[PDB]
Design a protein around this nucleic acid. Sequence first.
RNA 1: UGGUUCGUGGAGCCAUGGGGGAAUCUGGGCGGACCACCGCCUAAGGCUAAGUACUCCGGGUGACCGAUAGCGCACCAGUAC
RNA 2: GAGCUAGCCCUGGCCAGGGUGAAGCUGGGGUGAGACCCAGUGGAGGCCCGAACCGGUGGGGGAUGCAAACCCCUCGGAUGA
RNA 3: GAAUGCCGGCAUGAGUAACGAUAAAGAGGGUGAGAAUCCCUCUCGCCGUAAGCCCAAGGGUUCCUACGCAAUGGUCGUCAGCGUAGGGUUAGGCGGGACCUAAGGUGAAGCCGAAAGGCGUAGCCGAAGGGCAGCCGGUUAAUAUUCCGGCCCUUCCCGCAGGUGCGAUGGGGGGACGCUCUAGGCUAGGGGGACCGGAGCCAUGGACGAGCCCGGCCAGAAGCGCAGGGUGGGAGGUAGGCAAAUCCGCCUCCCAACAAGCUCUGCGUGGUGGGGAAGCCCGUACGGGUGACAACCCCCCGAAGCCAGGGAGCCAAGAAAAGCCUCUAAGCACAACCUGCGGGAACCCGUACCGCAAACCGACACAGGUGGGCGGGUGCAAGAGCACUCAGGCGCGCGGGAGAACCCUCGCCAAGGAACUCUGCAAGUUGGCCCCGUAACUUCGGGAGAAGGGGUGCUCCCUGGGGUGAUGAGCCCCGGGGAGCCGCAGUGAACAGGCUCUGGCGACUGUUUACCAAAAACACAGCUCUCUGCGAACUCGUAAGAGGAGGUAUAGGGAGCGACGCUUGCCCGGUGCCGGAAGGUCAAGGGGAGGGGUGCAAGCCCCGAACCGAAGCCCCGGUGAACGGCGGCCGUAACUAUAACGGUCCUAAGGUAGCGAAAUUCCUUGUCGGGUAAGUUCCGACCUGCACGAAAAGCGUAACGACCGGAGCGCUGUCUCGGCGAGGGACCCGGUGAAAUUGAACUGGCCGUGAAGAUGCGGCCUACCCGUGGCAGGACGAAAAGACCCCGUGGAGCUUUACUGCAGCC
RNA 4: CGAUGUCGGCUCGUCGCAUCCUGGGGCUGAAGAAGGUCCCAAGGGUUGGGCUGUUCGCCCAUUAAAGCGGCACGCGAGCUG
RNA 5: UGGGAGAGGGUGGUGGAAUUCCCGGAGUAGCGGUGAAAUGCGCAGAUACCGGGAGGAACGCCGAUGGCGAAGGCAGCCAC
Lengths: 49, 272
Amino acid sequence: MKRTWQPNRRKRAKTHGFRARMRTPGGRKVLKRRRQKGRWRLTPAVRKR
Amino acid sequence: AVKKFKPYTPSRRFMTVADFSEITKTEPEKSLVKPLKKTGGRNNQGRITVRFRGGGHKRLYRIIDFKRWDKVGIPAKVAAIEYDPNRSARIALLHYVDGEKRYIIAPDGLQVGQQVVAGPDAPIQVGNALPLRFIPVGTVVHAVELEPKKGAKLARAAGTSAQIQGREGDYVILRLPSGELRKVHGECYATVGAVGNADHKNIVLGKAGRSRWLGRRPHVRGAAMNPVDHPHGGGEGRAPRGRPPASPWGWQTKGLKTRKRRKPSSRFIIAR
RNA sequence: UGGUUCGUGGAGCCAUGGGGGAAUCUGGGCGGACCACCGCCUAAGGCUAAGUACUCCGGGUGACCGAUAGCGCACCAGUAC
RNA sequence: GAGCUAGCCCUGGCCAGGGUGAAGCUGGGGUGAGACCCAGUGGAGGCCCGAACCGGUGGGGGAUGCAAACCCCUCGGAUGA
RNA sequence: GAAUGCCGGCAUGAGUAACGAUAAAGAGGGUGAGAAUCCCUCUCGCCGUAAGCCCAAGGGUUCCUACGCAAUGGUCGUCAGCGUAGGGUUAGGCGGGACCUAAGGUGAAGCCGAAAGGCGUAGCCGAAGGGCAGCCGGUUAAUAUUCCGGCCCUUCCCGCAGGUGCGAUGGGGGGACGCUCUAGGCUAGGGGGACCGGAGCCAUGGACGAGCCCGGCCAGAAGCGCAGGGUGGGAGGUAGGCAAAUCCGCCUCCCAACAAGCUCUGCGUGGUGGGGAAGCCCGUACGGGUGACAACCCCCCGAAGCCAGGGAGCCAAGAAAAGCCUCUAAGCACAACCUGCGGGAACCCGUACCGCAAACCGACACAGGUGGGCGGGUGCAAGAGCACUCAGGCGCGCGGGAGAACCCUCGCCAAGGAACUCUGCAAGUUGGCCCCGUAACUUCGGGAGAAGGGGUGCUCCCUGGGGUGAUGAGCCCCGGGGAGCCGCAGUGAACAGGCUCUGGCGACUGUUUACCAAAAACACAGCUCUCUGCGAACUCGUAAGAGGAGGUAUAGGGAGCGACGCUUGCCCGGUGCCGGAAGGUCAAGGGGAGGGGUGCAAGCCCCGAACCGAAGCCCCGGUGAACGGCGGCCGUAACUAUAACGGUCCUAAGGUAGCGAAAUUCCUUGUCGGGUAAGUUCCGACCUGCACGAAAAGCGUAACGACCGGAGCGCUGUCUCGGCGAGGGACCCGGUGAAAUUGAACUGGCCGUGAAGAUGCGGCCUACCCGUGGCAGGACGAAAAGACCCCGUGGAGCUUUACUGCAGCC
RNA sequence: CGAUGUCGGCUCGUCGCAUCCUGGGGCUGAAGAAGGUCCCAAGGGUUGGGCUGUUCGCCCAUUAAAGCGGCACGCGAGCUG
RNA sequence: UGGGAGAGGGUGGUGGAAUUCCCGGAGUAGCGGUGAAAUGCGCAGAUACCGGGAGGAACGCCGAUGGCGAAGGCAGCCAC
Ligand SMILES: [Mg+2]
Ligand SMILES: [Mg+2]
Ligand SMILES: [Mg+2]
Ligand SMILES: [Mg+2]
Ligand SMILES: [Mg+2]
Ligand SMILES: [Mg+2]
Ligand SMILES: [Mg+2]
Ligand SMILES: [Mg+2]
Ligand SMILES: [Mg+2]
Ligand SMILES: [Mg+2]
Ligand SMILES: [Mg+2]
Ligand SMILES: [Mg+2]
Ligand SMILES: [Mg+2]
Ligand SMILES: [Mg+2]
Ligand SMILES: [Mg+2]
Ligand SMILES: [Mg+2]
Ligand SMILES: [Mg+2]
Ligand SMILES: [Mg+2]
Ligand SMILES: [Mg+2]
Ligand SMILES: [Mg+2]
Ligand SMILES: [Mg+2]
Ligand SMILES: [Mg+2]
Ligand SMILES: [Mg+2]
Ligand SMILES: [Mg+2]
Ligand SMILES: [Mg+2]
Ligand SMILES: [Mg+2]
Ligand SMILES: [Mg+2]
Ligand SMILES: [Mg+2]
Ligand SMILES: [Mg+2]
Ligand SMILES: [Mg+2]
Ligand SMILES: [Mg+2]
Ligand SMILES: [Mg+2]
Ligand SMILES: [Mg+2]
Ligand SMILES: [Mg+2]
Ligand SMILES: [Mg+2]
Ligand SMILES: [Mg+2]
Ligand SMILES: [Mg+2]
Ligand SMILES: [Mg+2]
Ligand SMILES: [Mg+2]
Ligand SMILES: [Mg+2]
Ligand SMILES: [Mg+2]
Ligand SMILES: [Mg+2]
Ligand SMILES: [Mg+2]
Ligand SMILES: [Mg+2]
Ligand SMILES: [Mg+2]
Ligand SMILES: [Mg+2]
Ligand SMILES: [Mg+2]
Ligand SMILES: [Mg+2]
Ligand SMILES: [Mg+2]
Ligand SMILES: [Mg+2]
Ligand SMILES: [Mg+2]
Ligand SMILES: [Mg+2]
Ligand SMILES: [Mg+2]
Ligand SMILES: [Mg+2]
Ligand SMILES: [Mg+2]
Ligand SMILES: [Mg+2]
Ligand SMILES: [Mg+2]
Ligand SMILES: [Mg+2]
Ligand SMILES: [Mg+2]
Ligand SMILES: [Mg+2]
Ligand SMILES: [Mg+2]
Ligand SMILES: [Mg+2]
Ligand SMILES: [Mg+2]
Ligand SMILES: [Mg+2]
Ligand SMILES: [Mg+2]
Ligand SMILES: [Mg+2]
Ligand SMILES: [Mg+2]
Ligand SMILES: [Mg+2]
Ligand SMILES: [Mg+2]
Ligand SMILES: [Mg+2]
Ligand SMILES: [Mg+2]
Ligand SMILES: [Mg+2]
Ligand SMILES: [Mg+2]
Ligand SMILES: [Mg+2]
Ligand SMILES: [Mg+2]
Ligand SMILES: [Mg+2]
Ligand SMILES: [Mg+2]
Ligand SMILES: [Mg+2]
Ligand SMILES: [Mg+2]
Ligand SMILES: [Mg+2]
Ligand SMILES: [Mg+2]
Ligand SMILES: [Mg+2]
Ligand SMILES: [Mg+2]
Ligand SMILES: [Mg+2]
Ligand SMILES: [Mg+2]
Ligand SMILES: [Mg+2]
Ligand SMILES: [Mg+2]
Ligand SMILES: [Mg+2]
Ligand SMILES: [Mg+2]
Ligand SMILES: [Mg+2]
Ligand SMILES: [Mg+2]
Ligand SMILES: [Mg+2]
Ligand SMILES: [Mg+2]
Ligand SMILES: [Mg+2]
Ligand SMILES: [Mg+2]
Ligand SMILES: [Mg+2]
Ligand SMILES: [Mg+2]
Ligand SMILES: [Mg+2]
Ligand SMILES: [Mg+2]
Ligand SMILES: [Mg+2]
Ligand SMILES: [Mg+2]
Ligand SMILES: [Mg+2]
Ligand SMILES: [Mg+2]
Ligand SMILES: [Mg+2]
Ligand SMILES: [Mg+2]
Ligand SMILES: [Mg+2]
Ligand SMILES: [Mg+2]
Ligand SMILES: [Mg+2]
Ligand SMILES: [Mg+2]
Ligand SMILES: [Mg+2]
Ligand SMILES: [Mg+2]
Ligand SMILES: [Mg+2]
Ligand SMILES: [Mg+2]
Ligand SMILES: [Mg+2]
Ligand SMILES: [Mg+2]
Ligand SMILES: [Mg+2]
Ligand SMILES: [Mg+2]
Ligand SMILES: [Mg+2]
Ligand SMILES: [Mg+2]
Ligand SMILES: [Mg+2]
Ligand SMILES: [Mg+2]
Ligand SMILES: [Mg+2]
Ligand SMILES: [Mg+2]
Ligand SMILES: [Mg+2]
Ligand SMILES: [Mg+2]
Ligand SMILES: [Mg+2]
Ligand SMILES: [Mg+2]
Ligand SMILES: [Mg+2]
Ligand SMILES: [Mg+2]
Ligand SMILES: [Mg+2]
Ligand SMILES: [Mg+2]
Ligand SMILES: [Mg+2]
Ligand SMILES: [Mg+2]
Ligand SMILES: [Mg+2]
Ligand SMILES: [Mg+2]
Ligand SMILES: [Mg+2]
Ligand SMILES: [Mg+2]
Ligand SMILES: [Mg+2]
Ligand SMILES: [Mg+2]
Ligand SMILES: [Mg+2]
Ligand SMILES: [Mg+2]
Ligand SMILES: [Mg+2]
Ligand SMILES: [Mg+2]
Ligand SMILES: [Mg+2]
Ligand SMILES: [Mg+2]
Ligand SMILES: [Mg+2]
Ligand SMILES: [Mg+2]
Ligand SMILES: [Mg+2]
Ligand SMILES: [Mg+2]
Ligand SMILES: [Mg+2]
Ligand SMILES: [Mg+2]
Ligand SMILES: [Mg+2]
Ligand SMILES: [Mg+2]
Ligand SMILES: [Mg+2]
Ligand SMILES: [Mg+2]
Ligand SMILES: [Mg+2]
Ligand SMILES: [Mg+2]
Ligand SMILES: [Mg+2]
Ligand SMILES: [Mg+2]
Ligand SMILES: [Mg+2]
Ligand SMILES: [Mg+2]
Ligand SMILES: [Mg+2]
Ligand SMILES: [Mg+2]
Ligand SMILES: [Mg+2]
Ligand SMILES: [Mg+2]
Ligand SMILES: [Mg+2]
Ligand SMILES: [Mg+2]
Ligand SMILES: [Mg+2]
Ligand SMILES: [Mg+2]
Ligand SMILES: [Mg+2]
Ligand SMILES: [Mg+2]
Ligand SMILES: [Mg+2]
Ligand SMILES: [Mg+2]
Ligand SMILES: [Mg+2]
Ligand SMILES: [Mg+2]
Ligand SMILES: [Mg+2]
Ligand SMILES: [Mg+2]
Ligand SMILES: [Mg+2]
Ligand SMILES: [Mg+2]
Ligand SMILES: [Mg+2]
Ligand SMILES: [Mg+2]
Ligand SMILES: [Mg+2]
Ligand SMILES: [Mg+2]
Ligand SMILES: [Mg+2]
Ligand SMILES: [Mg+2]
Ligand SMILES: [Mg+2]
Ligand SMILES: [Mg+2]
Ligand SMILES: [Mg+2]
Ligand SMILES: [Mg+2]
Ligand SMILES: [Mg+2]
Ligand SMILES: [Mg+2]
Ligand SMILES: [Mg+2]
Ligand SMILES: [Mg+2]
Ligand SMILES: [Mg+2]
Ligand SMILES: [Mg+2]
Ligand SMILES: [Mg+2]
Ligand SMILES: [Mg+2]
Ligand SMILES: [Mg+2]
Ligand SMILES: [Mg+2]
Ligand SMILES: [Mg+2]
Ligand SMILES: [Mg+2]
Ligand SMILES: [Mg+2]
Ligand SMILES: [Mg+2]
Ligand SMILES: [Mg+2]
Ligand SMILES: [Mg+2]
Ligand SMILES: [Mg+2]
Ligand SMILES: [Mg+2]
Ligand SMILES: [Mg+2]
Ligand SMILES: [Mg+2]
Ligand SMILES: [Mg+2]
Ligand SMILES: [Mg+2]
Ligand SMILES: [Mg+2]
Ligand SMILES: [Mg+2]
Ligand SMILES: [Mg+2]
Ligand SMILES: [Mg+2]
Ligand SMILES: [Mg+2]
Ligand SMILES: [Mg+2]
Ligand SMILES: [Mg+2]
Ligand SMILES: [Mg+2]
Ligand SMILES: [Mg+2]
Ligand SMILES: [Mg+2]
Ligand SMILES: [Mg+2]
Ligand SMILES: [Mg+2]
Ligand SMILES: [Mg+2]
Ligand SMILES: [Mg+2]
Ligand SMILES: [Mg+2]
Ligand SMILES: [Mg+2]
Ligand SMILES: [Mg+2]
Ligand SMILES: [Mg+2]
Ligand SMILES: [Mg+2]
Ligand SMILES: [Mg+2]
Ligand SMILES: [Mg+2]
Ligand SMILES: [Mg+2]
Ligand SMILES: [Mg+2]
Ligand SMILES: [Mg+2]
Ligand SMILES: [Mg+2]
Ligand SMILES: [Mg+2]
Ligand SMILES: [Mg+2]
Ligand SMILES: [Mg+2]
Ligand SMILES: [Mg+2]
Ligand SMILES: [Mg+2]
Ligand SMILES: [Mg+2]
Ligand SMILES: [Mg+2]
């Protein structure tokens, strides 16, 4: 049937992107936690141009 | 007059459509003066606050003239009578000798090509707008301002009117379409005559679809819900309520008066 | 109403949101309701190291572990997944 | 976290082919004027049958399955909420 | 040594199940160490509004080539979407951006918020919506509308030439729009041809023939020709389009009333440029040569596509901005702008490949899902239906045999037809088109495909209409009439309703418990009550603010019922609600009678009675389509029986109409009638309504229903009562090879016993060791820390006149 | 209760006799036929339907007869539901 | 042709008495109704009176034992 994952690059970038996280204090705290943890990727990699 | 249908389908045997013979050969509307983009939206910044809205036909908004004191003395010729989707009444497109084109809410009896004007002058004729003071006591009137220079706000629905009852200092007494007796300031403008399209109350929607065309989503009863959603929710196989009938938000819906008591408007109202 | 051991208790003192609303040494706060005596301070202005807390980092030491232990990782790990 | 799902808003697209033939109009009949009645035109409808398409009615199978909702026949809507 | 313990390793089942659609395979010849599986050739099968092509999102080296098989592929593998390495993605015109705006977001001004932060006209961002200049062929192993060839355009910048007052984010026009139905002319596409161009071919009885079989186009400036879309032209006046405005708007006069003319599209023609089948020869994993100086002609069907801003009708009344045109202002008129012609400039980003699927979402080469465009012929009425089949792409990444039981799918059946069974569940009957002919009832539409009957093929003859050809031949559609021919059967195969009576419920189309319930549940038009006068009520929010609504009593919100017909009665004692400037009680506050604590005292500090104190409750009334409720006992009529009549007790009042053993009736299969041979079901009645009842509405209601119950005609493997056959599994051989479960096991029956149900204890009986296909009786079989029950001073969800609080309101 | 699936039907039976019929038999208020009751005896047989979920029961047509009970109110790793 | 009578019918207006209700003044021991009385309204201030406001209905005397029309029926006035 129709599963839950329906990929969309614009949706992924607009929803989980660096700028979206930077827009609000909760997301800035997300970036802080991932930085302290030593995450190689602070935000999901959305590709194509 | 109201259009009727033969029962060639169910829901077509009670369906009924308004008569559009007063709509002069002008069905599509006027640019320039109107239309504006009309923002469909059943809700606030986020949350729905009036339930069961949405859907229905797209609409262009006709930005009509509710303050006629702009063109005091300037007459205008009634050019057309058109259908307005954002209101129950019809709208009259009039051309001012000034050249400016405006829409007035179209009163009963208004004919195409007829002369209309607004001001303290103004013969007491259907269509003309005057301050309430210079209008004869007893004549019926519509598009009545509430406070001077604030715009027409009383009697604008199809077939409505208010009647002048008397005067009292700077105020005149109106009997509003509800039957309320109201003190309205003499300087308030109003245009003589009734609204017209008074057969609007006689139209039978006919089917659910027609309700949807007007953007009215289905309204579900509290009895049909659960106690989480309405105190009328549950219980078992049907229920007579079990308490004084209430809204979803807990307030009683049969008799509970709700206008605030200490409103400063109180000393201008006389009736129901 | 809050803090203090103080939970309305004889309930003060310190701060306040609010209504009223003084004075400048013979002026004012306090010594736990209050009054008198006797005593201690001088509000409604700001700055002030040290001694005190902690360990991202470096060093030293261990009746600390020794690859199912020890930090999640001794090994390109907050990675693969 | 509304890329599944529920609602709404903005903007796009899609619904093969057939039947039934509302109103209205033309002619005629009829009257004092009508109402009204016949044809011809007409193409209305949450209209009928029914592919795409949207469903999931009944049965069989499937049950460590092809499948963490499937498969075969049958069934509903199918210009409209 | 145990914790259904944790981590890791290895056994069990077990060489067992499965090897992932029944569309299908056979042979031969290559390569290789090794071929059912890789390569090539032939025979065969499958899809073909796809299982074929082209885009979009997603994926991200999968594309191509060379060298390879340790692992991945459900087996094999010389193979690949795998490994190693190299190569391949070319744009002024395609798409996105130095263009525009919508929802929405952001957001200077401004508003609000303990803080973080929230709203927010302008502006901005924001897109398969608007705007924008390109088509056809050839080349690579891989790119091409990108490279090349031909022809054609678009902007900018600089120059000359001719013209004009140029001239803004500003003013106006325009862009600018719905649904259905459509006319005219074209195109794409397709059918065809005695016409043209072709390598070829007479087979097996006949055919040298207008014989068979293949192909008979593509794009293309200017100017043309045809169809079509847009548009009136002037002269005065002007107070409006937020400055100005020659523009627009508006009034008055004149010629047009035409699409004449002006532009603007599409389509034919077109200088010119390309392509060019079948068959044959070759060596490819494929392409090339030739056929080729290829021909490139005439009819017919004809679109949902183009002219597209065409036309008509209808209500529910159908985006915005920029590009584009005009108008003017500051400024400037040696500027600048328009037209024509030259020379120059024209960036950044994607471009491979998959793409209904082995490359996207599904942990998998998963039977699931995925938007848009093309999607051919033939025939059946038709069509994107169904059957065959072009182009093409596939035979679904385990095979070989066998011919068991048994399972699934499919076919057939004597005689009977529902006797089966919860129930005709399933399956079977019917089935498309043409013609007759159809009842009760009804809201006059329907019920209607009622029911139910007849025709359906093929040949010959005569013959009526249309459309394209000129008023004709051909050609393309429809008919009418008359004779004949054949088979069991003529929509001969495929797609293509069983029929009828009655009732319950809901009026009807619809919605819903994704993943057991599609209904009598929700919704629905309609009806009633109530609130609400606009800073409306109500809702979200602390607020700002937003919805309501750029709406105004014919409008908006809440509640209930639920088309329609007929109707909705009594009770206001209680509750809710509404109306009541009287009275009672009633908090803070005021007021101080009076008393108290210290003081030598003025004084300071306390309590503190009357008395004035709101809302609310009490009290007075109304109000039931508001919350709710609407009795009992004894007597009486001249056959009995019954009680129209009477009496009494009580309540706030003592169910009327209508229906009734019902979706409600326990006793109950109430009792009679009807359906049957037989009727706890069903229908019509009586009323003794345990326990209907009038808007949580009552009684009916045409039609409608994948809703439920009953009954009959028709038809059957459902049944007496089974039998046979086909195939995919099962089974044997080769090959890859799971699982939950498992204290260990060397695990019989009976009668007893044991914690009350023994393979294991007692006695007897039976019994050589070990396997294979199997049936399920057992091992209280497996699977889930029982979901019913109880317990815990365990948890959660709900409502209320439980407690105590909070928002909110007075 | 860290699992023993529960009514009814279908299918497969099997066991006990305190026997529904068939066979032997005492008595009989046994003329005979047919009955009543009764001792012995299970070897076998013990119908098809309507109603209802029904076990049971009531009926229709029969028959020699239309038996009662146990086996986890036998039997869902056999089926139905 | 020339004149006459009439509530003939209709549409639009329009007048006064009176009823009921709301608002203010001032006024208080009941009003009301019937054959008799009670319900009821009235100490929350009624009936009675005055002032203004609202709304609907028919048309007091004229008026007649009158007139008009086919009938049912038709009445304050005005114009059409
Ligand atoms: Mg907001
Ligand atoms: Mg909101
Ligand atoms: Mg938001
Ligand atoms: Mg409007
Ligand atoms: Mg209107
Ligand atoms: Mg509802
Ligand atoms: Mg509910
Ligand atoms: Mg509730
Ligand atoms: Mg509640
Ligand atoms: Mg429930
Ligand atoms: Mg109940
Ligand atoms: Mg309730
Ligand atoms: Mg109740
Ligand atoms: Mg009120
Ligand atoms: Mg409220
Ligand atoms: Mg109030
Ligand atoms: Mg405290
Ligand atoms: Mg304190
Ligand atoms: Mg104390
Ligand atoms: Mg204290
Ligand atoms: Mg203070
Ligand atoms: Mg102090
Ligand atoms: Mg002190
Ligand atoms: Mg002290
Ligand atoms: Mg200081
Ligand atoms: Mg280790
Ligand atoms: Mg470790
Ligand atoms: Mg979504
Ligand atoms: Mg399509
Ligand atoms: Mg008609
Ligand atoms: Mg139709
Ligand atoms: Mg329909
Ligand atoms: Mg239908
Ligand atoms: Mg259909
Ligand atoms: Mg559905
Ligand atoms: Mg489906
Ligand atoms: Mg199904
Ligand atoms: Mg199944
Ligand atoms: Mg159907
Ligand atoms: Mg252990
Ligand atoms: Mg162990
Ligand atoms: Mg132990
Ligand atoms: Mg375990
Ligand atoms: Mg094993
Ligand atoms: Mg094997
Ligand atoms: Mg086996
Ligand atoms: Mg086995
Ligand atoms: Mg096997
Ligand atoms: Mg398989
Ligand atoms: Mg071979
Ligand atoms: Mg070979
Ligand atoms: Mg070799
Ligand atoms: Mg795209
Ligand atoms: Mg992937
Ligand atoms: Mg790879
Ligand atoms: Mg190779
Ligand atoms: Mg390999
Ligand atoms: Mg392998
Ligand atoms: Mg596999
Ligand atoms: Mg290879
Ligand atoms: Mg490849
Ligand atoms: Mg590779
Ligand atoms: Mg640039
Ligand atoms: Mg640049
Ligand atoms: Mg752009
Ligand atoms: Mg931009
Ligand atoms: Mg923009
Ligand atoms: Mg906006
Ligand atoms: Mg928004
Ligand atoms: Mg922005
Ligand atoms: Mg914001
Ligand atoms: Mg905004
Ligand atoms: Mg576009
Ligand atoms: Mg473009
Ligand atoms: Mg390619
Ligand atoms: Mg070109
Ligand atoms: Mg100019
Ligand atoms: Mg200019
Ligand atoms: Mg310009
Ligand atoms: Mg503009
Ligand atoms: Mg514009
Ligand atoms: Mg044509
Ligand atoms: Mg062509
Ligand atoms: Mg053609
Ligand atoms: Mg041809
Ligand atoms: Mg042809
Ligand atoms: Mg030749
Ligand atoms: Mg021969
Ligand atoms: Mg041939
Ligand atoms: Mg040919
Ligand atoms: Mg041309
Ligand atoms: Mg022309
Ligand atoms: Mg001029
Ligand atoms: Mg002008
Ligand atoms: Mg101006
Ligand atoms: Mg040409
Ligand atoms: Mg060639
Ligand atoms: Mg090839
Ligand atoms: Mg189309
Ligand atoms: Mg048009
Ligand atoms: Mg059009
Ligand atoms: Mg616009
Ligand atoms: Mg702009
Ligand atoms: Mg100037
Ligand atoms: Mg100047
Ligand atoms: Mg490319
Ligand atoms: Mg490509
Ligand atoms: Mg493909
Ligand atoms: Mg598919
Ligand atoms: Mg597709
Ligand atoms: Mg698939
Ligand atoms: Mg997959
Ligand atoms: Mg596969
Ligand atoms: Mg699809
Ligand atoms: Mg086609
Ligand atoms: Mg076809
Ligand atoms: Mg064909
Ligand atoms: Mg055909
Ligand atoms: Mg057909
Ligand atoms: Mg198509
Ligand atoms: Mg098909
Ligand atoms: Mg092929
Ligand atoms: Mg396979
Ligand atoms: Mg058959
Ligand atoms: Mg048979
Ligand atoms: Mg037969
Ligand atoms: Mg029969
Ligand atoms: Mg039966
Ligand atoms: Mg049987
Ligand atoms: Mg049945
Ligand atoms: Mg069946
Ligand atoms: Mg048949
Ligand atoms: Mg058929
Ligand atoms: Mg059938
Ligand atoms: Mg037939
Ligand atoms: Mg009949
Ligand atoms: Mg009949
Ligand atoms: Mg009739
Ligand atoms: Mg019927
Ligand atoms: Mg009919
Ligand atoms: Mg028939
Ligand atoms: Mg001709
Ligand atoms: Mg012809
Ligand atoms: Mg025959
Ligand atoms: Mg077929
Ligand atoms: Mg059919
Ligand atoms: Mg039949
Ligand atoms: Mg029925
Ligand atoms: Mg009935
Ligand atoms: Mg019944
Ligand atoms: Mg229904
Ligand atoms: Mg239907
Ligand atoms: Mg469900
Ligand atoms: Mg879910
Ligand atoms: Mg689920
Ligand atoms: Mg669920
Ligand atoms: Mg289900
Ligand atoms: Mg259904
Ligand atoms: Mg009504
Ligand atoms: Mg609020
Ligand atoms: Mg607000
Ligand atoms: Mg607002
Ligand atoms: Mg608005
Ligand atoms: Mg309303
Ligand atoms: Mg409502
Ligand atoms: Mg209801
Ligand atoms: Mg009625
Ligand atoms: Mg009632
Ligand atoms: Mg009632
Ligand atoms: Mg009632
Ligand atoms: Mg009450
Ligand atoms: Mg009551
Ligand atoms: Mg009360
Ligand atoms: Mg009250
Ligand atoms: Mg009080
Ligand atoms: Mg006090
Ligand atoms: Mg003293
Ligand atoms: Mg009361
Ligand atoms: Mg007697
Ligand atoms: Mg009595
Ligand atoms: Mg009593
Ligand atoms: Mg009665
Ligand atoms: Mg009964
Ligand atoms: Mg009965
Ligand atoms: Mg009887
Ligand atoms: Mg009976
Ligand atoms: Mg039965
Ligand atoms: Mg009775
Ligand atoms: Mg009831
Ligand atoms: Mg009752
Ligand atoms: Mg009721
Ligand atoms: Mg009902
Ligand atoms: Mg009924
Ligand atoms: Mg009903
Ligand atoms: Mg009915
Ligand atoms: Mg249904
Ligand atoms: Mg339905
Ligand atoms: Mg039958
Ligand atoms: Mg069978
Ligand atoms: Mg059988
Ligand atoms: Mg037999
Ligand atoms: Mg077989
Ligand atoms: Mg094997
Ligand atoms: Mg035992
Ligand atoms: Mg032993
Ligand atoms: Mg033993
Ligand atoms: Mg075995
Ligand atoms: Mg088995
Ligand atoms: Mg067993
Ligand atoms: Mg055992
Ligand atoms: Mg067991
Ligand atoms: Mg557990
Ligand atoms: Mg447990
Ligand atoms: Mg348990
Ligand atoms: Mg229970
Ligand atoms: Mg307790
Ligand atoms: Mg508890
Ligand atoms: Mg909870
Ligand atoms: Mg248990
Ligand atoms: Mg335990
Ligand atoms: Mg256990
Ligand atoms: Mg167990
Ligand atoms: Mg167990
Ligand atoms: Mg039991
Ligand atoms: Mg049972
Ligand atoms: Mg015995
Ligand atoms: Mg015997
Ligand atoms: Mg005997
Ligand atoms: Mg005897
Ligand atoms: Mg005997
Ligand atoms: Mg025996
Ligand atoms: Mg025996
Ligand atoms: Mg039976
Ligand atoms: Mg029967
Ligand atoms: Mg026996
Ligand atoms: Mg037995
Ligand atoms: Mg028992
Ligand atoms: Mg039993
Ligand atoms: Mg039994
Ligand atoms: Mg079972
Ligand atoms: Mg069972
Ligand atoms: Mg068992
Ligand atoms: Mg099983």
